[PDB]
Curated annotation (Swiss-Prot):
Enzyme class: lyase
Family stated for the protein in its record: Belongs to the TrpA family.
Protein name: Tryptophan synthase alpha chain
Pfam family, one: Trp_syntA
The protein's annotated pathway: Amino-acid biosynthesis; L-tryptophan biosynthesis; L-tryptophan from chorismate: step 5/5
EC number assigned by the record: 4.2.1.20
Protein task: The alpha subunit is responsible for the aldol cleavage of indoleglycerol phosphate to indole and glyceraldehyde 3-phosphate.
UniProt xrefs under CDD domains: Tryptophan_synthase_alpha (cd04724)
GO molecular function annotation: lyase activity; molecular adaptor activity; tryptophan synthase activity
Gene designation: trpA
The entry's keywords: Amino-acid biosynthesis, Aromatic amino acid biosynthesis, Lyase, Tryptophan biosynthesis
Assembly information from the UniProt record: Tetramer of two alpha and two beta chains.
HAMAP family, alphabetized: Trp_synth_alpha
Domain of life of the organism encoding this protein: Bacteria
Length: 258
């Protein structure tokens, strides 16, 4: 019962970084989204970063209310867990949905469907207590974003608070008084303070970029835009969309090996 931990030990032993693709659950549809995720895994994904969309009695237009509901998202999440029992599953989201459902209740449902971690992107690390507590109470790993221009205090806070993995923001992600430092420095400090293994994210869409992150010491990499662009390119060709996704994922994953 430590999916990230188990995963990172297996990867390290094999001298490999982790490739973590990101997709928004339900895009472009529920059935196709599940197939997209299976193809990602079959192609070499070590863990998943899944976005959970949110936007809210009396209807108006089908296009207004349009969207996959949060209940449908957890349902999906449970099927994914059922088909792939050991793959680390992490959610990426904003707080409103968490606030909507209720803090404790939201993490309680993450634990029921087998979600391993949660990154509420818009929550400052200083105002994270209610989220951390809910996370640990339901055996979910609370995730924090480490900015590349973080001072030593923030690095320490993130190191003692995070579990599972630390989300390391690339230099391209910033923007502004303290300069954005090189990945190598941050990786070294995080290790120094015993932070959870770092996964780098933002702007990483090519094999050479993934290789550079792992050579700099990152435990892995995350990528989203390239997958979004592939979906849109074959939005009308579902099967062709899958083949094209497998073609993108293999080189990215290969680049994590040495």
């Amino acid at each position: 019962m430590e999916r990230y931990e188990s995963l990172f030990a297996q990867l390290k032993e094999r001298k490999e970084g982790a490739f973590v693709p990101f997709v928004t659950l339900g895009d472009p549809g529920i059935e196709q989204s599940l197939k997209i995720i299976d193809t990602l895994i079959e192609a070499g994904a070590d863990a998943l970063e899944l976005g959970i969309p949110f936007s809210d009695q009396n209807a108006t237009l089908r296009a207004f209310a349009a969207g996959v509901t949060p209940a449908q998202c957890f349902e999906m999440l449970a099927l994914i867990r059922q088909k792939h029992p050991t793959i680390p599953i992490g959610l990426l989201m904003y707080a409103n949905l968490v606030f909507n459902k209720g803090i404790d209740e939201f993490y309680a449902q993450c634990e029921k469907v087998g979600v391993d971690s949660v990154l509420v992107a818009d929550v400052p690390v200083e105002e994270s207590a209610p989220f951390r507590q809910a996370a640990l109470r339901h055996n979910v790993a609370p995730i924090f974003i480490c900015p590349p221009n973080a001072d030593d205090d923030l690095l320490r806070q993130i190191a003692s608070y995070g579990r599972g993995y630390t989300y390391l923001l690339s230099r391209a992600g910033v923007t502004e008084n303290r300069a954005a430092l090189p990945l190598n420095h941050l990786v070294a400090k995080l290790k120094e303070y015993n932070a959870a293994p770092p996964l780098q994210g933002f702007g990483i869409s090519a094999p050479d970029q993934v290789k550079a992150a792992i050579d700099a010491g990152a435990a892995g990499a995350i990528s989203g835009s390239a997958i979004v662009k592939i979906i849109e390119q074959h939005i009308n060709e579902p099967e062709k969309m899958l083949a094209a996704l497998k073609v993108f994922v293999q080189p990215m994953k290969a680049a994590t090996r040495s």
